[PDB]
Amino acid sequence: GSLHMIDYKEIEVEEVVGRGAFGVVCKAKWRAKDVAIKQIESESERKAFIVELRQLSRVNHPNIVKLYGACLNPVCLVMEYAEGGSLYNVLHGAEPLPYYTAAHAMSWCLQCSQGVAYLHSMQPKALIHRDLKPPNLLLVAGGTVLKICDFGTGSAAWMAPEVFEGSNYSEKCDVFSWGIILWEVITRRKPFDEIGGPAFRIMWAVHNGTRPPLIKNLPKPIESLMTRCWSKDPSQRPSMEEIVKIMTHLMRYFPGADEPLQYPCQHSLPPGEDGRVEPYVDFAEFYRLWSVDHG
Template sequence: MKKLLDKIKGRVQPSKSYTPLEINNNIEEISSIKQFKMLHVCGQGTFSSVYKAEWTERGIIVAAKKVLALTTNEREILDRLKNEHIIETYGTILQSPDHYIIMEYAAGGSLYNYLRSRNGDRLTSEHFYRWTEHATEAVRYLGSIHIAHRDIKSPNYLITENQLKLCDFGTAKFSKKGTSMTSQEKGSAAWMAPEMIRDRLASEKSDVYSLGVVIWELFTGGIPHAGADNHYQIMWLVAVNGVRPTIPEDCPAPLRQLMKDCWEEDRYSRPTAEDLLQKIRTKSLGLPLFV
């Protein structure tokens, strides 16, 4: 156990209106960030900052994500993505020192922040089913083109026109059999599958584990592993003690079982996102349909 804990700590064109589908048939190589008027900061992380910006030549609002670098792998992945529940990428700026990803702007912010704003009030059943379907469809789509996102979590689901859309593909990889993670690609502890913690191995089934945590959030409105002191403790609880988010007693049995299936220790025993979608779309999770 000490060896595992040591491992965990050591990782430590013309002017007109464009719709998203019109813009992103192919990701554009944009010459300069000067084409954009920065409005305000939407969010900041260790390696990136996201700005709300106006693309002045096109008269639309976008999100401009400033990154340290854009790898060939990330660019290839962004080029492949085309799904209504994936945030659209319009273009990239690769002129040093400016490296930006220009994306669809999500005015509703993140799912994580939205749930916090509700102060514990649960979503209606209709709302839960709709957003759970959106979140799951994004993971299903990625699996269908053999991409492991490796950082599925509520802060990476954005709200636009009452839809959930998945974003942030900085740690994503093409993978048919699973892919290792470098020490810089840590994921987020509260959503990480045990094999990501122990073996630094991520796969489409690891994404399903993380999706199960997001579904738990959508049902409860809570923060996963909120009682833990820090992310190292969460990793220890998940990878060593087999702890999972606490499912409320009033959770319907079919939904409870779906979450538990997503959190199976053996990743090969977890369902596919396609399996999950069938239950969600047929509203077979035991929730009343008009609440």
């Protein structure tokens, strides 16, 4: 629980790259280092911004964004620069989009659950992220390593129904989100894109039972996990610790996650029947590797 202190005058700020729950994130330089910083856009944000430092001073984990230091001259946080930027951008952003594999898809989710599991295990009190979604998931090391940010804080497509119903919630809201992200990286589709209108239309939908469509040829181990994560009832969702364990196990069947994203991709988006959709990733190699171990 300590924060390295930075003089703001020794930072050279550059173009905007993000905006989280509050503040604004920019590309910047600091001691000849490529860097991200978030600032307060308004003096009114001073208080929330201080709480986030008190949490981030305590966290420390490979799948959470490295906070280099901070400053109070004007109040600001200095982080590592995710060259890849947002997972949202990688999946859905401007062209050219990178090619990625099932192995990448699962490795990303594994890494996210590892990050959240750490948060959930925090003492004296668990940190709940509350806003898990690809815009908050940053990539480094050539698309290989995923890192969480904007935690302890257009979100409706990843929000557990008990949250937006204003009711009591817990760690399990993050598990719902994670279930949605899993679907998203396997399909490379925006959840509830075809619903649209404002967020309340998605909230009504999800509240009333609606989930993303099922995925043609999805392995059942993964399908059962994903859909347990989506349960209306939070107590029916697995814990993140369990998701980590499961996902660690499945990675046996997904080699190649260490390969950097380097191939462009011009995939079209072929709409399924309306009931089921096709995955973007290919599970053929999973089914083959699985056969060698089992039947």
